[PDB]
Amino acid sequence: ARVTVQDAVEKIGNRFDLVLVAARRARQMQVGGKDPLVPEENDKTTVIALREIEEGLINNQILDVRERQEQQEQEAAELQAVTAIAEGR
Amino acid sequence: RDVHPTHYGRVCPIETPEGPNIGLINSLSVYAQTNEYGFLETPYRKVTDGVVTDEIHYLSAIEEGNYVIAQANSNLDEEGHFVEDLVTCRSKGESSLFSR
Amino acid sequence: TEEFDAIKIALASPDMIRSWSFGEVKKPETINYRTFKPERDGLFCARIFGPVKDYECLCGKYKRLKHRGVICEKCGVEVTQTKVRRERMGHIELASPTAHIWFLKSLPSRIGLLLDMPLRDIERVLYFESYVVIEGGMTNLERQQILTEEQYLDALEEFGDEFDAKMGAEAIQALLKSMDLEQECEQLREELNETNSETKRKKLTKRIKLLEAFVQSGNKPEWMILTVLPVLPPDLRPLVPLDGGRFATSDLNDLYRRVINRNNRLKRLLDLAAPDIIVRNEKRMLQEAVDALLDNGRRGRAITGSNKRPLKSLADMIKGKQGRFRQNLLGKRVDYSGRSVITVGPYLRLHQCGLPKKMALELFKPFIYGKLELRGLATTIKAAKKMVEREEAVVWDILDEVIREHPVLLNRAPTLHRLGIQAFEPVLIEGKAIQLHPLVCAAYNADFDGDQMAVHVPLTLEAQLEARALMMSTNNILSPANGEPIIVPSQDVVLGLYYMTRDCVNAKGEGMVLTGPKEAERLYRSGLASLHARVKVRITEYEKDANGELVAKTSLKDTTVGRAILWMIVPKGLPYSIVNQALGKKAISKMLNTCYRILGLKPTVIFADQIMYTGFAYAARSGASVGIDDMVIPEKKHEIISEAEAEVAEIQEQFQSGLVTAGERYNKVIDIWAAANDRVSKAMMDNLQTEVSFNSIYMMADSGARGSAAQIRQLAGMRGLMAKPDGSIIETPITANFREGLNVLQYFISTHGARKGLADTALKTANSGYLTRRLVDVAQDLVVTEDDCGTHEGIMMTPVIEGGDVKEPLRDRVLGRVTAEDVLKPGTADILVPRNTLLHEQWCDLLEENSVDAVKVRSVVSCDTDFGVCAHCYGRDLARGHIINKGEAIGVIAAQSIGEPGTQLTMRTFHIGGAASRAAAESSIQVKNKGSIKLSNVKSVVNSSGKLVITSRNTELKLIDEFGRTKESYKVPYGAVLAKGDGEQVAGGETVANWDPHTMPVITEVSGFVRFTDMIDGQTITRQTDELTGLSSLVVLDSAERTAGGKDLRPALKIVDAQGNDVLIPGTDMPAQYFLPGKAIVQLEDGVQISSGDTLARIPQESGGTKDITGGLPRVADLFEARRPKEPAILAEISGIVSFGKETKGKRRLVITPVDGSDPYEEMIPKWRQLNVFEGERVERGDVISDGPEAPHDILRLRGVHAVTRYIVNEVQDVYRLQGVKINDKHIEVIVRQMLRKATIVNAGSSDFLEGEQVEYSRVKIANRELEANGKVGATYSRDLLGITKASLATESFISAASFQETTRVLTEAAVAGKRDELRGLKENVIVGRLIPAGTGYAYHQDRMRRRAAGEAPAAPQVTAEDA
Amino acid sequence: GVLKIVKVYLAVKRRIQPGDKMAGRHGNKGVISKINPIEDMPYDENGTPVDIVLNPLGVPSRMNIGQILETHLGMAAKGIGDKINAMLKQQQEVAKLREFIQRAYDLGADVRQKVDLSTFSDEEVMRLAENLRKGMPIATPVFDGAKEAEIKELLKLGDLPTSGQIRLYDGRTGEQFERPVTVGYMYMLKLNHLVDDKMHARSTGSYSLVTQQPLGGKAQFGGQRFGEMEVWALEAYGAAYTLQEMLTVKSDDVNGRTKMYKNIVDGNHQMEPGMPESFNVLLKEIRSLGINIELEDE
Amino acid sequence: GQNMRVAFMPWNGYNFEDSILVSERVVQEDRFTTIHIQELACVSRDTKLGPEEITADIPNVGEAALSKLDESGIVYIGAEVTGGDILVGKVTPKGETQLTPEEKLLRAIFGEKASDVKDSSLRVPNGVSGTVIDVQVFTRDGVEKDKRA
Ligand SMILES: [Zn+2]
Ligand SMILES: [Zn+2]
C-alpha cells in the first residue's frame, strides 16, 4: 500500500482530517515552490506530499497561523510568497 | 419457462439464450417438426414384436400417451432381434419395466 | 469560500422577485436567425440583461476600444462579456396573477384545509370555469359563503359602489388575506378536546397541521398566488439549428411566447372596466398558458401537431412522467470515461491496475498539454491540440511521466456496495482488456466471460490525494456490512499453499515418530536407505528449515519442508511471526482480520502481495490438474445400488399380495434412495483421506477454492433427487451420473431444477439497483456527528436468546456495539463503563446465558441526536477495524450492504410463495450426558396424581452443564410430566420427561371449588360415553352439533373460593375460567374441592401445521415494506390467561377473560395454523399464537418499543444467515428508525394530539422539560410504524422525497411551512451540486499546514507589531 | 435515402488480443488474459508447446466433466478410431508407411475386434476403412456414446501415455513436473466481437442542447453513464471533491469544463467548483413556479 | 473453432476465474484472424442554401486525404485507409450567419461555387484502421449524372 499509512492515520484525530492536510500540503507544494525534505534522502523517481507529513517537521493545527484582526488565513500566504523563490503563475 | 415432462424429443429443454432472457425462448429440437395443424409430432420407429422396422411415423402429443414407447439407450444388434426381455421403458411421464 | 451552512426554501414575494430581475419584458421578442444581437425588448435585451458580441454596440456608433467604459449618448448601453446575460434575470409583470397547480391538485389541499371550502370540489370550479366567487368589500355579508350566477347579489340602490367580483386565481388572493390565522388557532385548540361531538373534532384536527405552519417562522399563505412570472435564462435555451433541417429546441420556447401574448391585453381590462363576462375570457386563455410550465396531464395535456406527447414541462423533468426518471438516475454520461473487457492481473498488486495504453491517449489528454511545453514535443498549447488529439506515438513517453502518481477509478455497472468504485495506480498494458486484481475480484460480483468495467480520471489534485488514502483498495480491507473482509485469497491462490503444507502416507508399518524420542531418530534414519521405511512418509529429523530443503532436493526427504519453507518466506517481508502461522483453508479469511488488529494497515498491504505471488507460484509447481480418473468411484457404490434395486422390487410384490397399504409403500421407496446418495458420497470422502491425500479433484474441494458437498456427489457417486418446478418431489430417483452414461431421461429431470437458477439472475442483471433504491432513499440522512452525548434513555434490552427461526434456536446478537452500563457476568471478564466490545466479547455473553436474560446495550433506534447519530450507539463499522470516525454516511453504507446479498436470494413472488415442512413429536425425553435441568418461563406444581405436571408450553428444555453450555434442545408440550424439577441433578441416560402423545389435559392453576357455568343438558352438554375410559360422564357437545340458540353459549368450569368470589391467576388479574371444548372428558363432580394441578378436560386428538415458512428475497421487501404476510397470525390484543374454547375437528377456538369481559374475546382458529399457545401461564401482549409471521403495524401497538426494533431487524437476518451472508445489526437499525421517525402523541404539550410530526423534535421537548427543570411534563407518545416507501415519501427535505413519483405533495409542504432545510444527508447534497458533508465536508475538518521555516516567519511579523 | 448514398465498408484484421472471449462446446466460457510468450509456458518432452491453458478449478464448481472426456479423447485420438484412418489409410498411399503401420499396429492394439494389418491385405483393409469414413475424428453421439469402460480400453491401444495423464515439464524451471497432468487436443471456439467490444475512448466531445450531458455518435464515442448505483459508492467513501466534480466539472457544469481545462494545461490545479449547471437549471425551474429556492450563507 | 494443444494447469494467477492463456505463436500465425466488416453510411440532405454535393472538392484537409479519393470524393476500392482518412466525400453549405464580409465579395465575383460550402466529410472512427473492400454507387437522375456515374 502506501508508506506508513497507519502511522499517518495515527498522526491525526480524524481520518478525514489527514486527507485534508496532505491535500492542502500538496497545494502549497506546487504553488509556492517546493518542500522541507530534500537533500539527504527524500523520495526517488518522480513522486509526492505524505512523505513529508510522515516526518516530524510539518505542523497541522485547527488554526495555527492566521491574523489578529479579521479571519485572514492570508497572512500565511504573504509570508510564504516572500520566502519561496520559485513562482507559479 | 420451465420445461414440462411431456416435452420429450420435441424440444431441447436447454436451448435458451443466456442473458436477459432465460427460458423465454428455447429453440426447436432436431427431428421435431411442425406438421400440419400445429400439433408437433416427433418421429417414432414402429417396432412389431421382437423385430424393429426401419419405418418412421409421426405420433401426436396426445396419441403418444396411448402407446408404450421404448428408448434409444437399448442395445440392438441390427433390426430383427432384441437384447434382453426386460429393458427400461418409458410411457408418458412414468418409468416401468416392459417386455419386448 | 466559506462553508455552506444551510439553505432555505420559501415562496417568492412580488417585492422579492423584482430584486434579482431588472427591467421588464413586454413583448415576446427573441433572437433572429441572422444576427445574435437582441431584437426588441423581449426575453433578449442588452439593457435588461447584456450584449452579445465583444464591445460593439447595437447601433454601431462606437465599436473601437477607445470607448470601453463610457456609454453612447444617443443609446447608452454598457457592454460587457456575453456571460453576464446568463446569470442576470428578468421578470414579467403579469396583470391578473395565476395559481400553482401544485397547491391545488394535491390531495392535502393547502387552501382547502386552511380556508373552509371543498378541498377538491370548489377548486376545479372557480379556477378554470367562470364560477365567480366574491372576494370582499362592503357588499354582500357573505365573506366565506360562495355563490354562483343567479346567486350573484347586487346593490338595489340608486348609486352603488363598484363590486369586486372576480374569479379564478386572482380571487383566491383576497380570500386568503381575509382569513386571520390567529383567530383560527385559538378556537382550534378548544373545539377538539372540549366538544363531545366526534363530527367536529375530526374536521379541525386535520386543518391545523397546516394552519400552524404559516403561524410559525414559515411565511404567509398570501404568497402562493404567482403574481410575477420569472423568465427562463437566455443562453439556457438556445435556438441553434442541428443537422440539415431538423431543429433541437426546448419545449419552453413555445410556452413563454404564449403567456406574454395573453398579458398585455389583460392590462387594458383592469384600469377601465372589469365585466364578469369579459375579463374571464381573457384569463381563460392565459391560465392555460402558465399551466403548461406547471404540469400537463393532471387535467388537459398539450399535444403537438400530429403527436400524442405532452410537452415536457419544468416539473416533468424531475418526476419524469414520460418515464425519463429511469434515465435521469440511470447515469450522467461522464465526459472522461471508457469501457472494455476485464481480465486478471497476477503480478498486478492491489495498489495498481492494468489499463490499455491507447485508452490513456484520449482520456488523459488534458494532463498531456501541460507537460508538452516543458519538453521539445510540442511548442504551444494551441498547436498541440491537433497532434496529441489522435493516433500519435511521440506521446507514449511524456504521457507515462504524468501517470507517475495519479491513480484512477475503476467501476462495474452493477454497483451494489461501496467497493463498487475503487482507486488504483494506472499501468500501461498492451491489449484492450483491463487487468483487475485477483483479490479485488471478490469485491465485484462478476466473472471473466465478457463483463466490462468503466474507468474515470481524477482532475483536481485535491480529489486525487484523497483517492490514495481513503479510496484506495488496499486501504479498505474490511467490508461495510460485517467485520469480515471481502477481498481474500479464493481459489488458485489457496490451492498452491494448501498443496505445499501436506503430508503423504503410503506403505507404513512401524510407528515412525522421530520428532521427540531419541531411539526413533536413529532407527528410522538408516531405514530410509533400506527397503522398509519409505520416503513419502511421516519423518522429521534435521537442523533448521533452510537446511531442510537442501536435503529434500536430493530425493532424500519429501514433506516437513513445505511447512518450513512457508514459515520463513511469508514472515520475511513482514515481522511478527507469532501471528503469522495460521493459514489453513477457513483461516484464509481470518488472517486478514487478525493481522490488521495486532499489526497495522501498512504492514497488511505488503502482506497481501506475498501470499499472492507464492499462492499462484506453487500452484503450477505441483499441478493440480483435474481428470476423468481423478473422480475415484467408491467401491461401496455398486453394493448400495444393488441393495436399492432389490428393495424396490420387494415392496412392489408386497403391494400385489396384501401386506402394505398405501402409506408405508411410498415413504419406503423414497427413503432408500434419499440416503443411497449420502452413503456413496461419504464413501469417497473417507476413502481418499486414507489412501491418497494428494487427489486433485478432492483437495480442490476440501480446502478453499470452489467446492460443495452437493455438486461433488453428483459427479462422483449419484445425484440424490430432483424436485419439480412446483415443489413436489418426484417418486422416481436417478441412478446414472455425470461420469457414466447419462441417459436422456435423467438428464431431462434435472432440467426442471436447472431452469430456476439461471432464470433468477436474468431479471436482476437488468437492474440490480432496484432493491437498493428502496433503502438508500430512506436512511440517506444518517451522518456521523458524535459529541460525547451519552444518552441512557430508551435503553434497548438484548434478549439472551433470539426469537425463533424454527421453534427453538440458539444464537446471540451483539457485535462491536458499546454497552449501556456496567454489567458483571463472567468470572474474570468485566465490561466497565460504556466501552466498545470486541468480537470475542459476544462469546462471553453467550457463555453465561443461563444467568443473564437481558444485555444492556445502547442502540441507534434510541438516540438523542436528531439528524445525525452518535458514535457510541453505532459501533466500529466504517471502512477499517477501529472506532467509527466523524463524518460518515452510515445510511448509504447500510442500505448497500442489504441490496447486495439480495442478489443471491431466491426470487419467486413478492407476495411470498410457499414451502413444505412436517410436524412431528415424541413423548420421550432421555438425557444424553450429565448435569442439571434448566427451565425458563415455567410454573411447575404437584397435583393429586403425584406427578410434577407443568402449566406452560414452549419451555426451553436443554442440558446445561456446570460451565453453562447448550448441549441439548427439547420441546416440552402442555400437560407434560417432569421426572425432576429445576436445579435437580440428573444422570446419563435417564428419563426426565414423559407425557401422553394423544391427549392434551386441560389443567387449572389455582385451587378452590369447581362451579358449572353455561352448561345445560340438551343445549351444550349431553350424556355421552368415551371409547377408552368407559365411564359415563357429562360431555360437552360440538359447535356444529349444538342446537339453535346455543351458539353464544360457552361451557366453562369457573373456579371460585369458599366465599364464592372469583379466583385470580397469580401474577396478573385474570379470572380462573377454563372453557370446556367439545367432546371433552369431564370426570369431576360439582362443588367438589380441587387443587392446582388437577385435570379438568382432555383433548382426544391433535393436529395442525403442514404449510408454513417463507424465507427468501420476497420476505425482505415484505419486512422493510410492512404489508400483509402470507400466513397472518392473530396477535393477542390483551395480555392475560389463555385457554382454548373448542377442539372440534371443524373449527378450534380460543377465549381470554381479561377482567369484566370474557366470552366476547373469542378467536377463530382454522386447522392450518399450528397452535403454539398453551392453556395455563399468562402470555405476553403481542405474543405469537399461530405458526407464521407477524404484522409490524399491530405488534407495534401491543407489546412496546423494545419489540419492533428487535424483530424487524431479526427476521430479516434469518434469511441471509441461511445462505451464509453475515450482516451486522448496526446496518439494519439505522433504516428502521426512519420507519418510526414519525408518530402521534396522546398528551398535548406544544401541539395538539393528532399531528403526525417527527419524533426527533418531540424527543428534545420532553428532554429539557423533564431532565433539566421547569416542571417536568409527561409528553408521552405512541410509536407509528410505516414502510420504506411511505416513510421516505414524506420527509423533512423536499429534494430527498423528490426521488419518488409524488413530487407534487412534497415540494408544497416544505414551501408553505417555510421550513429551513439543513442539508445533512449526502444524497440531497449531490443533486444540488454542493460539497459532500462526509468529507471532508464536515465543518470539523478546517486546518492549515506549517513548516518550521514558515513558523518563524510569521513570528517575524508578530515581532514587528510591537511598538517602540 | 435522398441525393444518393455512399456506403463504405471497412475491414479490419481482428487478431487475437487481450479481451477476446473463447469457449468450447461444454459451457466453459472464458476470456484471454495475457498473451504469454512460448518461453514461460510449459511444454512436453517432445517439443510441441501448449497452445491454450485452462483452469482445472473450473470443474469442481462448474459441473462439466464432459470437457475433460474430450481431452482424453483428443490425446488418445492417435490410437482409438482415428488410428484406423490415420495409419491404415496412409499406408495404402505411401509405400514407405505400409512397412511401419503393419508392425507398429499389432504392438499397440492386440484386440481381435480391431483390423489386423498383418493378416488383412491391401484390398481387405481398404474396405475396412470405408465403413467409418464419415466419422474421421471418431464418432460420439449425445446421451448414448462413450463409456467409462470403453474409453480406458481404447487408450492402451495407441500412443502414448497410460490411463490419461502424462508427465510433462515446467516451462519456467524445466525440471520434472510433479505428478502427470491431463493433456490433449480440446476443440475450442472463438467468439465474435460485437460493436460494444470496440474500445470507447472519450475526453472532450459534443454536448446536448437542452442538457449539458456529453453525447456520442459516429466519430466521438459515447460517454459511460454514472448511475445512482455508482453515486452511492463515492457517497460512501470520505471523499467529497471526487463525487462533487463527478456530476459537475465532468459533465453538466458548463463553466466547469472550461476553467478546468485551462488550468490543467498551465500546470496548476483547477479552480474550486463554483455553481454547477444542475444547480442553475433546477433552480430556474423553481423560480418560474409558485415556490422559490435561494442559497444561504453561514 | 480449431484444434490446439491443451494442458489444464493453474499457471500463475492469470487463469483465476474464467481466464484463458495462449502462447505467443497464436498471434504470429493467422489461425484466429477473423474478418470484420463495418458499415458507415453517409447521406446528403437538403440544406437551407440548397442540396448538398458529393465531390472531392473539400477544403480544410490534407493532401493524403484527397489522394486516395477520386474526382468525385469517393475513395477507390483497395485503399490502405486509417484513422483520419476520408471515406465519403460529402459537402455541406454554411450560411449567411457563418459567412464573412470578405468571402461575401468573392462570392458574387469569382462565382457562387467558391467559398459557400465548408468541410463535412465522413472520416474513419478513432481507433479502428482497416481497408476498403466495397464502395457504394448511387446517382439520382433528377440530380444529373455528374463525374460520379
Ligand atoms: Zn445606441
Ligand atoms: Zn447515541
Author numbering:
A (entry chain E): 2 to 90
B (entry chain C): 548 to 647
C (entry chain D): 14 to 704, 717 to 1389
D (entry chain C): 1045 to 1342
E (entry chain C): 797 to 945
Can you quote the paper on this entry?
We generated a single-particle cryo-EM (spEM) reconstruction of Eco RNAP by analyzing ∼42,000 images of Eco RNAP particles preserved in vitreous ice. Final refinement of image orientation parameters by projection matching yielded a structure of Eco RNAP with a 0.5 Fourier-shell cutoff resolution of ∼11.2 Å. Although the cryo-EM grids were prepared with samples of Eco RNAP holoenzyme (core RNAP plus the promoter-specificity σ70 subunit), the σ70 subunit apparently dissociated during grid preparation as density corresponding to σ70 was completely absent. The spEM reconstruction showed Eco core RNAP in a conformation similar to that observed in Thermus X-ray structures but with clear density corresponding to βi4, βi11, and β'i6. The crystal structures of Eco β2-βi4 and βflap-βi9 were spliced into the resulting homology model by superimposition of the overlapping β2 and βflap domains, respectively. The spEM map contained clear density corresponding to βi4, but density for βi9 was absent. In addition, extra density not accounted for by the homology model was present for βi11 and β'i6. An ab initio predicted structure of the short βi11 (see below) was placed into the corresponding density to fill in the gap in the Eco β sequence between 1121 and 1181. Flexible-fitting of the final Eco RNAP model (excluding ω, the C-terminal 41 residues of β', and βi9) into the spEM map was performed using YUP.SCX, resulting in a superb fit of the conserved RNAP as well as of the lineage-specific inserts (excluding βi9). In order to position βi9 in the context of the entire RNAP structure, we used our previously determined helical cryo-EM map of Eco core RNAP (hEM) and fit of the Taq core RNAP X-ray crystal structure since the hEM map contains strong density for βi9. The Eco core RNAP model was completed by adding back the C-terminal segment of β' as well as ω (in accordance with the Thermus RNAP structures).
